């Protein structure tokens, strides 16, 4: 039961799990109503016009496969439906063993307290918090790990982003930082079945639709990487050979790793070792920082308590003197779990749903959906409902057969 509370958009703010909040480095935004669906995880049912200065408008630019609709997610009812859709996908992910593990890792992934210039001092990094406005009018500073928010101008441009320090590279120095995922449970993508000799022949008809749960899990995987500060520099790319009429299409290692499967293998053995040793070295530095820490600022919690929070996050070893160190095999398990076990491909397998076999299998269309009604989608079966006749040959995902759950929009 990942979300132990039925949240309706119109429920009165209480200053605890329903409240108007302000986001860091968002300049001077108006407070937005948010919901805390799980410890360290909030959801803002608004179009994202706060995380980025240059993207504070929902206006359709000169363009470039995208989808725009400045009116999407503008009504309370829509926001209410958005909230229920996100909450439902989390329950779907969490219902699996893989998902239960991923979300647990995310919740234990508190961004490191490395905001002090004094090495004998542990301090929080302000951009890893939000201000929770209370019913009285005061604001309470709250640390959080994950924020799910609506998309910006391009509705289908989902992504996992964060604020990041002035000097430090939080998503790549092992510290981690609060992750903001632009996502929408109201849309999904259509892909075409790459007819391979051993693939099921009884496949209903043309287009199939991506299960929004796989899509959210995809972003959650980026979040895990970023929260543990072991994300692969987005500069790193593989020059994919597509056509002969193409002298090259770049695809980042971070994406190939996240998708997993055959795709992940484009990251050769030399690069894998490089990233692993690098991050191993980074964890060892976090251990040293914790070891030199004698005081904590922004006081409330005890020093030992916070040190312990990071001993748990990084799976550090503590001797009888109380000094932390990094254990090679524990690091290996943690790192492998985050980069090789949590992948889009492994989720497609747990969920038992049809999905593109690789990015190379680019989505043909964009569909409008609504997973909230149980008559349409369930936590356990997604679109391929049991009693129904949709639970056969993935009929539930067939946009021809399950034409009533999909409404074509673009491409
Ligand atoms: N299935 C999709 N078409 N996903 C939409 C987001 C694609 C984006 N590049 C991304 O992967 N972000 O993480
Ligand atoms: Zn991605």
Query: How many CB atoms neighbour CB 210 within 10 A?
Result: 21
Taking each helix axis from N to C end, the angle separating 76-95 and 97-108, rounded to the nearest 10 degrees, works out to 110
**Sequence ranges of the domains in the chain:** 1-411
Helix, strand or coil for residue 21?
Answer: strand
Query: How many CB atoms neighbour CB 134 within 10 A?
Result: 15
Query: How many CB atoms neighbour CB 53 within 10 A?
Result: 10
Helix, strand or coil for residue 255?
Answer: helix
Per-residue CA distances from 83 to 89, 281, 310 (Å): 10, 40, 31
**DSSP line for 23-40:** -TT--SPPPEEEEEEETT
Query: What's the chain's Rg over C-alpha atoms?
Result: 22
Instruction: Report helix, strand and coil shares of the chain as percent, to nearest 5.
Output: 30, 20, 50
Helix, strand or coil for residue 404?
Answer: helix
Distance CA 210, CA 367 (A): 10
Distance (Å) from CA 215 to ligand 2 centroid: 9
Distance CA 331, CA 276 (A): 9
Distance in Å from the first CA to the final CA of the chain: 38
* CB-CB contact of 259 with 240 (8 Å): no
What is the enclosing helix (H) or strand (E) of 63?
none
The residue whose two tokens read 């949709």 is: 390
Query: Is 222 assigned a ligand-binding role in the annotation?
Result: yes
Question: Where in 144-247 does DSSP place strands (E)?
Answer: 146-150, 159-161, 179-182, 187-191, 208-209, 237-240
Distance CA 242, CA 246 (A): 7
Assess whether the C-beta atom of 161 lies below 6 angstroms from ligand 1: no
Question: Where in 272-364 does DSSP place strands (E)?
Answer: 295-296, 317-318, 324-325
Name the residue among 257, 261, 269, 280 with its Cα closest to residue 327.
Answer: 280
What is the enclosing helix (H) or strand (E) of 52?
none
Distance CA 255, CA 343 (A): 10
Buried b (16+ CB within 10 A) or exposed e, 336-350: eebbeebbbbbbbee
The phi and psi torsions of 385 (rounded to 5 degrees) equal: -50, 135
Catalytic residue among 91, 193, 219, 344: 219
Closest CA to ligand 1's atom 5: 158
Assess whether the C-beta atom of 159 lies below 6 angstroms from ligand 1: yes
Residue 41 bridge partners (DSSP) = 38, 146
Residue 367 bridge partners (DSSP) = 188, 408
Distance (Å) from CA 54 to ligand 2 centroid: 22
**DSSP line for 365-401:** EEEE----STTT-BTTTBTS-SSSSTTSTTGGGBTTT
Helix, strand or coil for residue 49?
Answer: coil
The alpha-helical segments, DSSP class H, found in 52-170 are 76-95, 97-108
* CB-CB contact of 159 with 119 (8 Å): no
Residue 188 bridge partners (DSSP) = 367
Is 219 noted as a catalytic residue in this protein? yes
Query: Is 78 assigned a ligand-binding role in the annotation?
Result: no
- CA 149 from chain centre, in angstroms, equals 11
Strand 146-150 relative to strand 41-47: parallel, antiparallel, unpaired?
parallel
- For the record, the structure tokens of 42 come out as 């909030």
Assess whether the C-beta atom of 22 lies below 6 angstroms from ligand 1: no
Q: Is the dihedral of CA 159, 44, 124, 166 positive or negative?
A: positive
Question: Which top CATH class is 1-411?
Answer: alpha beta
Assess whether the C-beta atom of 189 lies below 6 angstroms from ligand 1: yes
Distance CA 33, CA 47 (A): 12
Distance (Å) from CA 9 to ligand 1 centroid: 27
């Amino acid at each position: 039961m990942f979300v132990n509370k039925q949240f309706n958009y119109k429920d009165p703010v209480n200053g605890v799990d329903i409240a108007y909040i302000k986001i860091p480095n968002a300049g001077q935004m108006q407070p937005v109503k948010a919901f805390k669906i799980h410890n360290k995880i909030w959801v803002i049912p608004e179009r994202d016009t706060f995380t980025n200065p240059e993207e504070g408008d929902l206006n359709p630019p000169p363009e470039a496969v995208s989808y725009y609709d400045s009116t999407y997610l503008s009504t309370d009812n829509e926001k209410d439906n958005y909230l229920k859709g996100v909450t439902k996908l989390f329950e779907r992910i969490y219902s699996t063993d893989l998902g239960r593990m991923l979300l647990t890792s995310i919740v234990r992934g508190i961004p490191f307290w490395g905001g002090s210039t004094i090495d004998t001092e542990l301090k929080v990094i302000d951009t890893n918090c939000i201000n929770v406005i209370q019913p009285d009018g005061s604001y309470r500073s709250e640390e959080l790990n994950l924020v799910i928010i609506g998309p910006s101008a391009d509705i289908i441009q989902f992504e996992c982003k964060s604020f990041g320090h002035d000097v430090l590279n939080l998503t790549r120095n092992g510290y981690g930082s609060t992750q903001y995922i632009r996502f929408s449970p109201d849309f999904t993508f259509g892909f075409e079945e790459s007819l391979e000799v051993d693939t099921n022949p009884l496949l209903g008809a043309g287009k199939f639709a991506t299960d929004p749960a796989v899509t959210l899990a995809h972003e959650l995987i980026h979040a895990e990487h970023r929260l543990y500060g072991i994300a692969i520099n987005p500069n790193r790319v593989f020059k994919v050979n597509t056509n002969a009429y193409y002298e090259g299409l770049e695809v980042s290692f971070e994406e190939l790793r996240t998708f997993g499967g055959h795709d992940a293998k484009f990251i050769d053995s030399l690069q894998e070792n490089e990233f692993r040793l690098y991050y191993y070295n980074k964890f060892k530095d976090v251990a040293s920082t914790l070891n030199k820490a004698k005081s904590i600022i922004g006081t409330t919690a005890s020093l030992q308590y916070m040190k312990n929070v990071f001993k748990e996050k990084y799976l550090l070893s503590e001797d009888t003197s109380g000094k932390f160190s990094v254990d090679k095999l524990k690091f290996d398990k943690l790192y492998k779990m985050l980069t090789e076990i949590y992948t889009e491909d492994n989720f497609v397998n747990f969920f038992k749903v049809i999905n593109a076999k690789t990015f190379l299998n680019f989505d043909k269309a964009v569909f409008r959906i609504n997973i909230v009604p149980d008559e349409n989608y369930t936590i356990k079966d997604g679109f391929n409902l049991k009693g129904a006749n949709l639970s056969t040959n993935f009929n539930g995902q067939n946009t021809e057969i399950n034409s009533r759950n999909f409404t074509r929009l673009k491409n």
